[PDB]
Design a protein around this ligand. Structure first.
Ligand SMILES: NC(=O)c1ccc[n+]([C@@H]2O[C@H](COP(=O)([O-])OP(=O)(O)OC[C@H]3O[C@@H](n4cnc5c(N)ncnc54)[C@H](OP(=O)(O)O)[C@@H]3O)[C@@H](O)[C@H]2O)c1
Ligand SMILES: CCc1nc(N)nc(N)c1OCCCOc1ccccc1CCC(=O)O
Length: 155
């Protein structure tokens, strides 16, 4: 029932130092069009990784998963388990993806062809296996020259 969206190095990395280690104007655009008008479900560290200007993300119901129910998240709902929201998007991070993967039938992935080598402590995308039906988009080039591609997985 759950559906997930993320961007990742082609090496598997979604986050380093509690932020994303690249800027990609096209992926920001696509993520925004996929989630706008829908609840967005995220974990506590993704919440505080947001740039202040976009905390909470505009035009969407923001839901933060945390162990502390009295946690302060101004302008977001706080919950203590993964919610069963009918139109939510699971937007990260690495812990929340691992929890959700088993209960997921859809994955919308951005891939980034970047010099990024795994480091102790990185946040990593889930491993998608031969149980998924894959739809692979062609490689594209961003203004900066960084090359990326959109992929779809369904179950
Ligand atoms: N590139 C992308 O597409 C993408 C997308 C999303 C995030 N990110 C990156 O991912 C990194 C952060 O991800 P992360 O894995 O470190 O953090 P996270 O998964 O977003 O949040 C982890 C926190 O969620 C809470 N939590 C986890 N499981 C819970 C449960 N079962 N019940 C209640 N609360 C629970 C805990 O916070 P408490 O300590 O409050 O309990 C836990 O420490 C950052 O670098 C961010 O930029 C990247
Ligand atoms: C944008 C990175 C990103 N890209 C994809 N494909 N999926 C995600 N779940 C994701 O993470 C969403 C959470 C991080 O959101 C941001 C991080 C930095 C700047 C702006 C935004 C989102 C801004 C907005 O949606 O209005």
């Amino acid at each position: 029932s759950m559906r997930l969206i993320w961007a990742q190095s082609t090496s598997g990395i979604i986050g380093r130092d509690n932020s994303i280690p690249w800027r990609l104007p096209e992926d920001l655009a696509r993520f925004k069009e996929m989630t706008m008008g829908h609840p967005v479900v995220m974990g506590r560290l993704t919440w505080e990784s947001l740039p202040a200007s976009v905390r909470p993300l505009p035009g969407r119901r923001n839901i933060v998963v945390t162990r502390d129910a009295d946690y302060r998240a101004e302008g977001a709902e706080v919950v203590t388990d993964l919610p069963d929201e009918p139109d939510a998007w699971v937007i990260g991070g690495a812990q929340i993806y691992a929890m959700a993967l088993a209960r997921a039938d859809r994955c919308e992935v951005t891939e980034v062809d970047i010099a990024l080598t795994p480091l102790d402590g990185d946040a990593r995308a889930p491993v998608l296996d031969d149980s998924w039906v894959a739809t692979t988009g062609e490689w594209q080039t961003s203004t900066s020259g960084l090359r990326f591609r959109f992929c779809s997985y369904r179950r």
